[PDB]
């Protein structure tokens, strides 16, 4: 059972890209779980169908202590028998969400959530701001990491900045960058652009994802594109991303680049 952690610069496309990838994975008859390590609590909203259900941290607040919670309360079945859970967290400007992520993953691990025959466990991590948000990539958490990026100067600065922090957990641990996933700038010189960075990093660009508004038609209609419009152009695209991932065996240790070489790229 592989567990992969999906990272990226907030607002480039982690959750959709994920829920859709697992939605596709679910289509392939796979036992998957989506751990939502983001205070926003939308990591599962597209597979379960709603704003969001009762989260771990929010729930554990009710019982007084997290140790009082039961995996039955947070873990819920959604589309294609995909299991979901949310790490929960505070509100803008109060508390430590980096903690919830920890509390939540510990709980899942602790309550033997990795107990049933799961084939894939996807951690949809938000911003990699501090120590807690690195939780997914220790030992026993996720081994494969799929950084999301785009053709923007800052979207890559991140993909770069992210993989940089990974080398700490990657050297000492076993977690590794499996590849970048691109959610484009329309394909206008980007189809190959990211591939450049993927190399200077030492990883591959697993798959390129289009800017198809079918994602908004699904997003606003509270579902994935794979359930929403099964044959839409980007429905297969997401099926591709899913298929490539499954067969992907390229897991490397990231080689960060410098601002200078970074900007050098775009510059050319």
């Amino acid at each position: 059972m592989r567990q992969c952690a999906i990272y990226g610069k907030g607002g480039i496309g982690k959750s959709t890209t994920t829920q859709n990838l697992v939605a596709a994975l679910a289509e392939m008859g796979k036992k998957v779980m989506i751990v939502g390590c983001d205070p926003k609590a939308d990591s599962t909203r597209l597979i379960l169908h709603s704003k969001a259900q009762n989260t771990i941290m929010e729930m554990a607040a009710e019982a007084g202590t997290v140790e009082d919670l039961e995996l039955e309360d947070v873990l819920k079945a959604g589309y294609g028998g995909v299991k979901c859970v949310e790490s929960g967290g505070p509100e803008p400007g109060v508390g430590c969400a980096g903690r919830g992520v920890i509390t939540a993953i510990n709980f899942l691990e602790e309550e033997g959530a990795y107990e049933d025959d799961l084939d894939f466990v996807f951690y949809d991590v938000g911003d990699v701001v501090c120590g807690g948000f690195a939780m997914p990539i220790r030992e026993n958490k996720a081994q494969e990491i799929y950084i999301v990026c785009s053709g923007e100067m800052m979207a890559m600065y991140a993909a770069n900045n992210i993989s940089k922090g990974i080398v700490k957990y990657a050297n000492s641990g076993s977690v590794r960058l499996g590849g970048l996933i691109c959610n484009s700038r329309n394909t206008d010189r980007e189809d190959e652009l990211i591939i450049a960075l993927a190399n200077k990093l030492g990883t591959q660009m697993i798959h390129f994802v289009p800017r198809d508004n079918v994602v908004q038609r699904a997003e606003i209609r509270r579902m994935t594109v794979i359930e929403y419009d099964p044959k839409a152009k980007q429905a297969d695209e997401y099926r591709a991303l899913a298929r490539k991932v499954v067969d992907n065996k390229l897991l490397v240790i990231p080689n960060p680049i410098t601002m200078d070489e970074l900007e050098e790229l775009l510059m050319e």
């Binding site: 941290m57 607040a61 007084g64 202590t65 997290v66 505070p90 109060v94 508390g95 430590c96 903690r99």
Partner: protein, 476 residues
């Protein structure tokens, strides 16, 4: 013993990997009785090297431990998890009068007892309900000092705001005191954070209130945490010299007593490391001169008894002499009784930021020459007061570590040593007489005249006790 300490020091440091090696080698240097800066001789107040057995504390030990804890008519809330609060409950021996639980709350421990979720969701909301429960369950509480802990510092809670709301609401003074452990290199910051914390929320509230009468003698004892009664053992002399002791800061202190410091004629400071900061704001904002004194032993107290006198009129001076004459026979009596037993016995010390240099005089009088000292959180301006009080080619340490200290003790071979609880045992095992200095080893007052008496007797019961001769078994 001139080049010795150097062949001793770099031999001790010899074990230290190069990162720590260079560093420590600058914290311990030979003392020349005449240099007036330690920036050429030794360094202090820097970060402590990892994994080394330090005794240094944190900013918390300084604000809730030394400075606030002592205010007997207030309720100091340990804001943060459970450990801290329950590790310092009655640890410090700063004595006080009152009805604990009813009027006073010092040997008591109030904590917000942070749980998993408090940390996640952060918690000022818990702090407000908690500032509420005290007012109801502890009516006579006269203010609340909220001592923060590490978590509060990271989670970033507005313990500053709540204290304004609840308090401006409950019509009671609340001190949003920030003493996060991760702050500072030692406990020191806690002091500086405390001092200021005082001048902000407590000190300046009686500013346009003159229902008080400033007598040309009114004063306040600042920096006497009254460990064992030292504050009373000193508040007695001043008053018997005619001065009017108005305030005592931390050490049976009253929140109000702290509020009357601004209207005094003189601030007497025994702890130049803890209340030195405040004593300046005390003078630049209010304009109230302050001075440093020392009440350890006859010659120091006697001397000081006169310094604090000259800052007044001759009237008090002749009165002062009467006090000195009174105790002259008593302390003389002590020396003639004990000095014979302590004579020539040398001693080795290691304290916080005042006693390290301040106790030597109390020793000179007993004839126990001091051959080594150190601080765990002092600054150069604290060593600047030391070099003089010391002999030449004496070894000094700053933030000394187990290996560092233990090796000096093993080589210099002292008859008596004085440090804290963490260290009291390691040497008692080496058959070296140890006498706690922090807690006075649960003994009586040492400051002042009556105090000196007990001291001179406490060194004797321990140093010359029979136990020591019984260490190595006969058959060996």
């Amino acid at each position: 013993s001139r080049e010795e300490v150097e062949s001793l020091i770099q031999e001790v440091l010899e074990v230290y990997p190069e990162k720590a090696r260079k560093d420590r080698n600058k914290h311990l240097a030979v003392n020349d009785p005449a240099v007036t800066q330690s920036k050429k001789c030794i360094i202090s107040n820097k970060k402590s090297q990892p994994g080394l057995m330090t005794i240094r504390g944190c900013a918390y030990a300084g604000s809730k431990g030394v400075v606030w804890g002592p205010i007997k008519d207030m309720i100091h809330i340990s804001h943060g998890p459970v450990g801290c609060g329950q590790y310092s409950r009655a640890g410090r021996r700063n004595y006080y009068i009152g009805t604990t639980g009813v009027n006073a709350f010092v040997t008591m421990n109030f904590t917000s007892d942070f749980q998993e979720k408090d940390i996640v969701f952060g918690g000022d909301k818990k702090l407000a309900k908690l500032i509420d429960e005290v007012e109801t369950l502890f009516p006579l509480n006269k203010g609340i000092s909220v001592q923060s802990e590490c978590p509060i510092g990271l989670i970033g809670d507005d313990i500053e705001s709540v204290s304004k709301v609840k308090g401006a609401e409950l019509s009671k003074t609340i001190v949003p005191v920030r003493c996060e452990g991760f702050r500072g290199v030692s406990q020191s910051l806690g002091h500086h954070i405390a001092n200021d914390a005082v001048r902000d929320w407590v000190l300046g509230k009686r500013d346009e209130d003159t229902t008080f009468a400033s007598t040309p003698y009114d004063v306040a004892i600042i920096g006497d945490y009254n460990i064992g009664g030292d504050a009373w053992s000193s508040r007695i002399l001043l008053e018997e010299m005619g001065l009017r002791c108005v305030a005592q800061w931390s050490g049976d202190g009253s929140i109000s007593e702290i509020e009357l410091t601004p209207k005094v004629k003189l601030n007497l400071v025994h702890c130049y490391r803890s209340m030195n900061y405040i004593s300046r704001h005390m003078e630049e904002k209010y304009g109230i001169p302050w001075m440093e004194y020392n009440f350890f032993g006859p010659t120091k107290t006697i001397e000081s008894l006169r310094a604090i006198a000259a800052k007044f009129d001759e009237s008090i001076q002749k009165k002062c002499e009467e006090v000195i004459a009174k105790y002259k026979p008593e302390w003389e009596a002590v020396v003639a009784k004990y000095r014979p037993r302590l004579e020539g016995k040398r001693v080795m010390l290691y304290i916080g930021g005042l006693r390290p240099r301040h106790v030597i005089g109390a020793y000179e009088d007993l004839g126990m020459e001091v051959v080594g000292t150190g601080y765990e959180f002092a600054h150069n301006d604290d060593y600047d007061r030391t070099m003089k009080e010391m002999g030449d080619s004496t070894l000094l340490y700053d933030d000394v570590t187990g290996y560092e200290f233990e090796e000096f003790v093993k080589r210099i071979k002292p008859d008596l040593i004085g440090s804290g609880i963490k260290e009291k045992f390691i040497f008692q095992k080496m058959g070296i007489p140890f006498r706690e200095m922090h807690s006075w080893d649960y003994s009586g007052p040492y400051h002042g005249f009556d105090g000196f008496a007990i001291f001179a007797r406490d060194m004797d019961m321990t140093l010359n006790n029979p136990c020591w001769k019984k260490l190595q078994a006969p058959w060996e």
